[PDB]
Every structure is written in structure tokens, then in C-alpha cells.
Design an enzyme around this catalytic site. Structure first.
Site, short mmCIF file in Angstrom:
data_model
loop_
_atom_site.label_atom_id
_atom_site.label_comp_id
_atom_site.label_asym_id
_atom_site.label_seq_id
_atom_site.Cartn_x
_atom_site.Cartn_y
_atom_site.Cartn_z
N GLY A 135 0.48 -2.61 11.56
CA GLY A 135 0.65 -2.44 12.80
C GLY A 135 1.46 -1.22 13.44
N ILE A 186 4.21 7.99 4.68
CA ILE A 186 3.89 8.87 3.26
C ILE A 186 4.32 10.32 3.66
CG2 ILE A 186 1.99 9.90 1.96
CD1 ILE A 186 2.44 6.88 1.39
N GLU A 206 6.69 -7.51 13.75
CA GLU A 206 5.55 -7.96 12.88
C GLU A 206 6.21 -9.25 11.96
OE1 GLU A 206 3.43 -5.33 10.43
OE2 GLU A 206 2.28 -4.87 12.17
N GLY A 212 10.14 -2.39 9.67
CA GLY A 212 9.41 -2.82 8.61
C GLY A 212 10.02 -3.41 7.55
N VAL A 213 9.30 -3.32 6.20
CA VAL A 213 10.12 -4.01 5.09
C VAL A 213 10.63 -2.88 4.16
CG1 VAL A 213 9.04 -6.20 5.60
CG2 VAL A 213 8.06 -4.45 4.16
N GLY A 214 11.35 -3.12 2.99
CA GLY A 214 11.92 -2.51 2.07
C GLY A 214 13.29 -1.59 2.07
N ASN A 215 13.52 -0.65 1.46
CA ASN A 215 14.96 0.07 1.04
C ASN A 215 15.47 0.44 2.45
OD1 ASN A 215 16.67 1.31 -0.61
ND2 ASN A 215 15.42 3.13 -0.35
N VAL A 216 14.76 1.15 3.24
CA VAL A 216 15.32 1.86 4.34
C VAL A 216 15.67 0.85 5.33
CG1 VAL A 216 14.73 3.54 6.00
CG2 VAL A 216 14.32 4.21 3.86
C1 LIG Z 1 4.80 -2.73 12.22
C2 LIG Z 1 3.74 -2.25 10.87
C3 LIG Z 1 4.42 -1.71 9.95
N1 LIG Z 1 3.25 -1.35 8.84
C4 LIG Z 1 3.33 -0.31 8.49
O1 LIG Z 1 4.03 0.90 8.75
C5 LIG Z 1 2.35 0.13 7.35
C6 LIG Z 1 2.15 1.38 6.73
N2 LIG Z 1 3.43 1.54 5.96
C7 LIG Z 1 3.32 1.53 4.75
O2 LIG Z 1 2.60 1.09 3.96
C8 LIG Z 1 5.01 2.08 4.05
O3 LIG Z 1 5.69 2.21 5.20
C9 LIG Z 1 4.64 3.27 3.33
C10 LIG Z 1 4.05 4.46 4.25
C11 LIG Z 1 3.79 3.43 2.09
C12 LIG Z 1 6.01 3.69 3.05
O4 LIG Z 1 6.76 2.67 2.25
P1 LIG Z 1 8.20 2.63 2.24
O5 LIG Z 1 8.99 2.98 3.36
O6 LIG Z 1 8.62 1.17 1.43
O7 LIG Z 1 8.60 3.70 1.08
P2 LIG Z 1 8.69 4.31 -0.30
O8 LIG Z 1 9.39 5.54 -0.57
O9 LIG Z 1 9.38 2.91 -1.17
O10 LIG Z 1 7.23 4.25 -0.83
C13 LIG Z 1 6.24 3.44 -1.01
C14 LIG Z 1 5.27 3.96 -1.78
O11 LIG Z 1 4.36 5.13 -1.57
C15 LIG Z 1 4.75 6.10 -2.44
N3 LIG Z 1 4.97 7.46 -1.57
C16 LIG Z 1 5.73 7.59 -0.42
N4 LIG Z 1 5.73 8.90 0.21
C17 LIG Z 1 4.60 9.35 -0.62
C18 LIG Z 1 4.19 10.96 -0.67
N5 LIG Z 1 4.52 11.75 0.33
N6 LIG Z 1 3.22 11.09 -1.53
C19 LIG Z 1 2.84 10.23 -2.36
N7 LIG Z 1 3.47 8.91 -2.71
C20 LIG Z 1 4.28 8.58 -1.65
C21 LIG Z 1 5.98 5.82 -3.19
O12 LIG Z 1 5.78 6.67 -4.36
C22 LIG Z 1 5.68 4.21 -3.30
O13 LIG Z 1 4.72 4.28 -4.25
P3 LIG Z 1 4.85 3.32 -5.47
O14 LIG Z 1 4.92 1.87 -5.21
O15 LIG Z 1 6.22 3.89 -6.36
O16 LIG Z 1 3.70 3.48 -6.41
#
Ligand SMILES: CCCNC(=O)CCNC(=O)[C@H](O)C(C)(C)COP(=O)(O)OP(=O)(O)OC[C@H]1O[C@@H](n2cnc3c(N)ncnc32)[C@H](O)[C@@H]1OP(=O)(O)O
Ligand SMILES: CCCNC(=O)CCNC(=O)[C@H](O)C(C)(C)COP(=O)(O)OP(=O)(O)OC[C@H]1O[C@@H](n2cnc3c(N)ncnc32)[C@H](O)[C@@H]1OP(=O)(O)O
Lengths: 504, 512
Positions: B386, B362, B292, B267-271
């Protein structure tokens, strides 16, 4: 007529008891068997008795049992009674084994059926010590002719250190020729092969399972029956469900969103799916084709009436009486049926390519159309996910079918929140109960809820569901998928506490 | 000159005028995927006219169907104007997210690889408009896409009228990077075999095809993609990446993966950034991407030779990385293939290639069901995207997350997830900064022992263990033990108090 036509292999014939001695405590055992068809019978029984004796002397004796899908009393039943299975995958319908699983005495994981072979090759279940496969016959060149299912047998034969074959004289010799076993890489090491199936009736392989004869440690001559439950004769509820679905298909055809012969049909496990087929056998759709996991009584009926031209599946799931009809008429039916490896019948790439229509049963759905296929109250296993995910996600249309209530009205099959999810909203487009049909295409979750509540819920429960949804819309943390977490699972708890989801 | 078809030059007109082609109630399909390649000037003009109508009591909204996420000029402007009645399949704009969570915009987050097929089936209605960004228009009227392909070919096929934005900000040497197939991937069954057996394999050509008679307007633009700032790995991300890279190393030493691993999806981002930095330095070679997205860390490995090819539907780059690739587009064009998203996200191809899927979440419950989307069960974050395409079809499905969220006030491992996107069957490996849970071969109770011991934060593990222990004793069935009276209670505790951690002024069973 001698079933073991390879002369050399006849020297490997031995008693089921001696054969079971090849199976050691801790062994991973891959077997034939899928929907009550084609599982080994005599070796599991002898094993079960020896397990019981060992346990009494204080010797540990358990195996991991990996199958195609469900088996029968002689396998799952006997071994569960002996407390002889420490891990089971991927699918069970035996009541004794179900009780072991729900008591925590047997570990269980219900994998997607089309994925099991690939995970076995990856090593997820461990090294296969034994393959135990039921056969109709052994050809002169040493090919193993399967019986009433193919399942995962070719993969288990490939992987196992030692092979035991049960040659079952009860099985019809004319099964030989009905199977299609492909030589290619479907479930092996990547990169895999392109599977060249572009029509549901296309054969791409051969009639036999292949195995190195040097791996065959024993052949057991057996004589025992496949056994399946009969299906419920369609009652007013199932007939109503079939009526709504047939009307739906009719409208799709008139709007030119389906061909007049529909698309390849997958019909799931259970009484409701079976009643739909009974409806189709006298329906207005001609030249149908089946591309399914199983051929139930209803589908065999469709083949009989001529409404369906050919059916592809991995197995027969026939009632005792249907099973006897096909054997008296195997000449008529053998040309209309193709039995494939389950990693081919349940291949998501093929299912999508062919544009299958998926029709599956369910325990319950929530108001947003997430579906539970498996775990009653969230924790008690029924059968398993089976191939319902393979088909629901990959299908051209994903349809779920259920009576609107269960347990004589004491359970609503439409609930505020499913206690367990097998199929997410994205994987379910059409819901049918005896109350009506909800077409969810194009809808957001709150729009899905309006349709599911108004079309599918039972009148006894619809006002309660509407009350939940309306108060959730007012008070939920977010409004995209409104919930009240204090009461989302409360109907299930009410059932646990009082025996009914209806308030006093 | 970017428009090399002379006849089509006569259709050039201003953004404002082009936007007038879009009517109240219209279904509009647009380019745009991970903040890249979405139209910019026409949506801005449309938003202005929408607001003006609304101020006079006139309704003016559209249905907006995209590739995936867009950017401020599209989702942002239209959400500010309250101009979208339905949105699909994937959004990351904050203003649009607020409309969705207020119930002002209806939303459905389809699997990204399925969107084209559902559009052709008619699930979104009849498409009135396709609005697509282009780098150029070729001599024979082909449309060269920009920094993403997405669903643009399907939208062009379906739409009654077509509007093209030709963006001179986009590098001309993008021409040739795309692979657009005319085969039946998402059309009427029976579909074609999609014959991809290598991540670097091209099956089509460099342009989108459209009947020029459907082109109603062409708009000359000059504006930047979203290009979100680079998310520098923190110590949590570096720990997660360290556990994951150790796991890969062990799989290779046990011959369960080649030294070149398998095609990688991230994906994208920190991790993801930390993982890509780890792969650049690790003991692997001849890596391949089938994903993707192309992100910053990938360019780095394509440059070093550590990665041989990267397949995606889009770019998701920082400003620095966007500058690097544009200064060296001739080099990177030979290393990257941008595909239609119904091909990049094809379950059949993902399985055939044996991809390794690495996705965020999440939360997961103790049994390893995964929520990717709906906070507290009801509040949309971005969408499933995706992640289902890849998690279910992959050779190995891995989910990665900090073990806590919101500064420790939420546990990412919970008794029961408040929403499920990925069932147990679709998740084999979990990684947090606490450790890695390898769940292969395990029943749900065995999954819970591993997830609680390896992945949960120390502050939450005793509470999780207490829930599990009492559920084992009291649950209706013991196959997936639950206590329904308290399964969602940590979420409700957060709603009510802002933390999942209890107080010692009341009894809690783990406290004793
Ligand atoms: C191959 C296709 C890949 N596509 C996808 O996985 C799409 C669905 N996934 C996603 O949208 C993201 O992977 C996720 C699930 C939002 C996680 O994002 P990420 O790994 O960048 O993690 P990160 O820790 O930075 O969190 C993203 C947001 O979700 C929030 N979040 C993450 N885990 C949470 C939890 N357990 N409860 C509440 N909020 C949560 C986090 O606070 C942040 O929100 P803000 O922007 O600060 O308001
Ligand atoms: C492509 C592969 C398809 N494979 C699968 O779908 C496997 C998973 N599906 C299944 O196991 C079955 O379709 C289902 C979900 C059990 C439904 O079966 P069916 O259509 O025969 O349903 P039916 O209404 O007759 O009920 C079957 C059983 O489930 C029970 N059941 C159904 N809905 C229930 C509910 N909401 N709550 C509790 N029990 C329920 C029902 O009481 C009966 O059990 P008992 O005989 O009383 O012990």
C-alpha cells in the site's frame, strides 16, 4: 462592450509597467495559464524588461513562477530571456525556459498537476505575494470571468497578498458561462469535502472566480493572443497507432469489458494522443464523453462530428486554426464543454470514480513497461509529468502511446531500462506503437517483457532487446525483474557518445 | 457454536476433502493480510496433494490472489510444494519469495487498494475458488471475518465456489469490529461516492455476504495467525523516530499541523515501533490512525487514550499484543475498525482525510526517487503493498530508513535507484539515523543537496557528493544530472564484491 462591468473596480486600471512594479525581487507569483491558454501577457513583458535593466545595474531581480501548467512566449519566454525566474512549477513547454531549466539557471519541479493547489495551500512554494490572472471580464458583482483555462487561478487568488488582473479584449466575451468553479474544499485544509461529481458532464459550481476586491492592487487592459503550436497532421505512424487502439477498444466492447460508448476519455498532451482522437471522430463508438486535462484539436473534432457528446477539461489546447474555429462557433461549442479547476479535472478520486480511460504519450518505456514521460537520457527535461500520473494511476485503463523510435530511428523508444521513471509498471497496462499493441493485464514482469518486445519494439531494435533480456534471465542478480546492470543504461550512453543507439 | 446458520452446517467437511475442490489451473482468492486471517488447514492439505501429484509426474498448481501477505500455512506450504504458478499482490513468506526470485512463481505486486478492482475487471482471470477464514457464521448466513478483511468480500462475489474455514482460535468478540460495505468501491464504473469523512466512520455492516448456494465446503479449524516476534527498536530506529517526532513538533509550532496531527499511516517493524513509542510519549493528543494495519504500539495508545481510534484492514501483532487484545477484545473492539482494503487504501479517502504517510524503503537516489521492492533492480523483497496508495495520496509523504544496509556494506542513498516505486513527486520527507531531509519546495538538484547532507551515511557521503559534482559538470542535461556510465555501478560493485565501498588499490574521485 465594457469588460469591467463593476464600476468601482474601473478606478484600479493602470499601466502594465506600473503594475509590474508591484512585483518585487524574491516574490512568489501565481499565474493563470494552462497549455498555452489563458496566461497573463503584458505584465510579464514589462516585468522582464525591468528585470533586465536591474540586472545590468547589478540589482538582483527574480521571482518564483507557479502556474496552472504551461504558458507561452509572453510569460515563460520573456521571463526566461530576462533570466528572471529562480524557481518554476509545475509544467513548462517554452523552449527558452526549458533551456534555462536544463542549464541549471532556473530551478524546476514538475508536480502532479492535480496536487499543485493543495501544495500551494500547504505552503510548499512559500507565501504567495502576487496572483496575476487573465480575465475575459469582471462582472457587476466583482466576479472574475476566466479565459481559455481555469487551472489553479482560484487557489492563487485565495492565497495571494495582492492581485493583478489582466483583462484581455482579445479573449472571447462568450467564454463567460463555460467555466465551473466550485466553492468547496478540494485542496484546502483537511478534512476536505466530498466532491459530488458522479458524471463527467455534471456542473457543481459557478461561472466566476471569487476574490475580495480589496486585494486587487491593479487591473491592466490588455490585447494579445494565446499562442500554441499546431499538431502534426497524423502521419502513417500515428495512424497505425490509432488503428491498433481502436481495434483494441472494439474487442473490449465485444467482450463486454467496456460499454459501447466506452468510458470517459482522457487524452494526453501531444501529437500521437491527438491522432487517436482523429481516429475516434469517425469511429464506431457513439455518445462518447471526455473527462480530460485538456481539449486538443482532435477532441474538438469529435465534438464537431457528434461522436463525443460533452467534454470536461481544465483548458483548451488548440492549434492557432482550431482556436479560431471555436471562437466563430462558441455558441455551438459552449454547451458541449465544461472547464473546471485543475484540482478537480485531475482529482484521482473523481478519475477513479468515473472510470476514465487514460491515453498518454511517452518518451520511452523499458522492457518491463516502466515509463519515462519527462527526462531524456535521464537528465534533460522535456516538458514535465503534467497530469499523466494523476490519470495513469487512477484510470480504469492506462494506455501509453508512442512511435517505436525517435530521432529518425537513432533512438529506440523501447529500452532495456528507462533512464528515468515517471510511471511504474503498476500504472501502465497497455502500450501501443506503430508496430503493434501490448496488452499487459495479468502479467508478471518477465511476461510483460515478452509482450512489449515482440509487439511494440521496432524491428531494428527488437533483436537487441531480446538479446539483453535473454542474457539478463541467465545472469541477473534476481530473476523477478532480470537486469544486467553493466549494460542497462548503455544504449542511452551509446546515444550520448555516438548520436545513435544502433551499434556500429 | 460458531455456525449459527443451521443449513450451512450440512456443508461441514474435512480439510482434505475440501481441498479436493481446488483443481490444477484454478484461480484461488483467499483471505489474509499482514500475516492475519488467512486460511490454514485447507492450504496445508492442498500442498500435500500437490506434492503427491508432482511425484507422479502430474501437474498441480494454482494462481493465488490474496489480500496481502499470509503465513507459513499458506504461502509457505504451497511454495514448499511448488504449487503456485502466479501470485498477487503481496508476499512476505521466505519460501515463496525464493520461488518468485527463481522464476518458478510469476508475481505481480499490485497497489493493494486496486487489487479488488482489477479482479472485478478480470485481470487475474475468472475466480474458481474463494477460500476465506471466518470467526463465525451468523443466523442469516453472514460470514464474520477474523483478524483481517482484505479482499475477501470481492473474492466471495467473484468466485464460482466458496470454501470457509471457521477458526475457533479467533476470538468470538471480533464479531462487530469489521465494517463491510455493499457499495460500489471496486465494481463497474460509475462507482459510488465512498462517503467517509472521519477515520472512525462506519458505512457498512459486520459481515461478508455470499450466496449460500456457492458454499461448497466449510472446515472447522483451530490454528494461530503468523504473529511475528516484536521488533524491539535499536538505536538506529530510536534516532530515526527522534528526528521524525522533532519534525512533527516543529510543524505543530508553525501551525502547519494541528496538535492532534492528522490521521497516521505507519508500517510494521523496528522503525515504526520506535515512532509509535515516540508518539505515546510526545506532546500530541487525540491522535487518529488511518492505516493498513493495527500494530502493537497502537494498542498501547488506544489503551492510554493518546489514540482515539485506529482504522486498518488487518492486525499485525506480536504474541504478547495478540494476547492483550484477546483478553480485552470488548474494549478494543470499540476503538478499532477493520475495513475492506479497497477502502483502507482508497486514494480518494486517504487524500480527503489528509493522512500522514510513513513508509520504509530499500533505497532512495540522491534526487529522492524511492525503491521499495527490488534489490539490485531484480530481486523481489516483499512488494509495493500500500506504499503507493498512501505516499501519493497523503498530505505528507515520509520515507524512513537506516542510512546503510547489510552491516554498512550497502548505502541506502545511491546515485540512481536500481528500481523505482515512488517518484520524486511522491516523497517529501526523508529520515535516517543521520538526520531529516525536508524537500518541500525543492528542485531535484536542491533535493540532492539536502538528501546528501542530511540523510547519507558519513562513509558514503563523499562518494555521493563526488558523483553529483561530476554529473553537474558532465551530464547530458543539468535538470537531473547523471553519469550513465556509473549510475548503477555501486549496485554492480555489490553484486561482484559484496560491498558498495571501493578499495584504495584503484582510483576513486572522492579519494582525492
Ligand atoms: C502502507 C503500506 C506499506 N507497505 C510497504 O511499504 C511495502 C513495501 N515495504 C517494505 O517491504 C519494507 O518497508 C522494506 C522496504 C523492505 C523495508 O523494511 P523495514 O523498514 O523493516 O527495514 P529493514 O532495514 O528491517 O529491512 C528489511 C529487509 O530489506 C533489506 N534491505 C533494506 N534496505 C536494503 C538495501 N538498501 N539493499 C539491500 N537490502 C536492503 C534488509 O537487509 C532486510 O532484509 P533481510 O530480512 O535481513 O534479508
Ligand atoms: C494528462 C496529462 C498528460 N500530460 C503529459 O503526458 C505530459 C508529459 N507528456 C509529454 O510531454 C508528451 O506526451 C511527450 C512524452 C513529449 C510525447 O509527445 P508526442 O506524443 O507529441 O510525441 P512525439 O513523438 O511527437 O515527440 C515529441 C518530442 O519528444 C521527443 N521524443 C519523443 N520520444 C523520445 C525519445 N525516446 N528520446 C528522445 N526524444 C524523444 C521528440 O523527438 C520530440 O522532440 P523534438 O520535436 O524532436 O524536439
Amino acid at each position: 462592450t465594457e469588460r469591467i462591468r463593476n464600476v468601482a473596480l474601473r478606478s484600479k486600471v493602470c499601466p502594465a509597467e506600473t503594475a509590474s512594479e508591484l512585483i518585487k525581487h524574491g516574490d512568489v507569483v501565481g499565474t493563470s495559464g494552462f497549455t498555452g491558454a489563458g496566461y497573463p501577457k503584458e505584465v510579464p513583458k514589462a516585468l522582464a524588461q525591468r528585470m533586465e535593466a536591474a540586472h545590468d545595474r547589478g540589482e538582483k531581480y527574480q521571482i518564483s513562477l507557479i502556474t496552472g501548467a504551461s504558458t507561452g512566449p509572453q510569460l515563460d519566454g520573456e521571463l526566461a530571456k530576462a533570466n528572471g525566474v529562480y524557481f518554476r512549477s509545475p509544467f513548462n513547454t517554452d523552449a527558452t525556459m526549458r533551456n534555462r531549466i536544463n542549464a541549471g539557471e532556473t530551478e524546476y519541479f514538475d508536480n502532479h498537476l492535480g496536487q499543485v493547489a493543495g501544495r500551494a495551500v500547504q505552503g510548499n512554494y512559500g507565501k504567495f505575494n502576487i496572483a496575476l490572472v487573465e480575465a475575459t471580464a469582471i462582472t457587476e458583482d466583482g466576479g472574475i470571468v476566466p479565459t481559455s483555462s481555469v487551472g489553479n487561478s482560484q487557489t492563487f487568488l485565495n492565497l495571494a497578498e495582492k492581485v493583478i488582473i489582466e483583462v484581455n479584449e482579445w479573449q472571447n466575451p462568450m467564454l463567460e458561462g463555460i467555466h465551473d468553479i466550485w466553492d468547496g474544499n478540494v485542496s484546502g485544509v483537511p478534512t476536505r469535502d466530498i466532491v459530488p461529481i458522479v458524471r463527467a458532464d455534471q456542473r457543481v459550481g459557478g461561472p466566476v472566480l471569487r476574490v475580495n476586491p480589496d486585494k486587487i492592487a491593479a487591473i491592466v487592459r490588455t490585447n494579445d493572443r494565446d499562442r500554441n503550436a499546431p499538431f502534426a497532421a497524423p502521419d502513417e505512424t500515428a495512424k497505425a497507432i490509432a488503428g491498433y487502439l481502436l481495434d483494441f477498444f472494439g474487442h473490449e466492447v465485444k467482450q463486454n469489458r467496456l460499454p459501447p460508448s466506452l468510458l470517459p476519455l482522457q487524452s494526453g498532451v501531444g501529437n500521437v494522443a491527438n491522432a487517436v482522437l482523429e481516429g475516434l471522430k469517425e469511429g464506431p463508438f457513439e455518445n462518447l464523453v471526455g473527462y480530460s486535462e485538456v481539449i486538443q484539436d482532435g477532441m474538438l473534432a469529435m465534438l464537431d462530428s457528434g461522436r463525443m457528446r460533452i467534454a470536461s477539461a481544465s483548458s483548451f489546447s488548440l492549434s492557432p486554426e482550431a482556436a479560431e474555429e471555436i471562437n466563430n462557433r462558441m455558441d455551438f461549442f459552449r454547451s458541449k464543454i465544461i472547464l473546471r479547476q485543475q484540482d478537480v479535472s485531475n482529482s484521482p478520486g473523481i478519475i477513479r470514480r468515473l472510470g476514465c480511460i487514460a491515453m498518454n504519450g511517452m518518451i520511452e518505456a523499458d522492457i518491463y513497461g516502466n515509463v519515462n514521460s519527462t527526462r531524456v537520457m535521464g537528465s534533460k527535461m522535456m516538458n514535465g509529468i503534467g497530469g499523466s500520473g494523476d490519470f495513469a494511476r487512477s484510470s480504469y485503463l492506462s494506455i501509453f502511446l508512442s512511435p517505436s523510435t525517435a530521432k529518425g530511428g537513432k533512438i529506440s523508444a523501447i529500452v532495456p531500462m528507462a533512464a528515468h521513471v515517471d510511471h511504474i509498471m503498476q500504472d501502465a497496462q497497455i502500450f501501443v506503437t506503430e508496430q503493434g499493441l501490448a496488452d499487459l493485464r495479468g502479467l508478471s514482469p518477465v511476461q510483460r517483457a515478452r509482450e512489449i518486445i515482440s509487439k511494440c519494439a521496432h524491428p531494428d531494435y527488437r533483436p537487441m532487446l531480446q538479446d539483453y533480456f535473454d542474457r539478463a534471465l541467465k545472469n541477473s542478480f534476481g530473476k523477478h525483474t532480470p537486469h544486467l546492470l553493466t549494460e542497462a543504461l548503455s544504449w542511452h550512453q551509446r546515444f550520448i557518445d555516438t548520436g545513435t543507439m544502433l551499434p556500429s
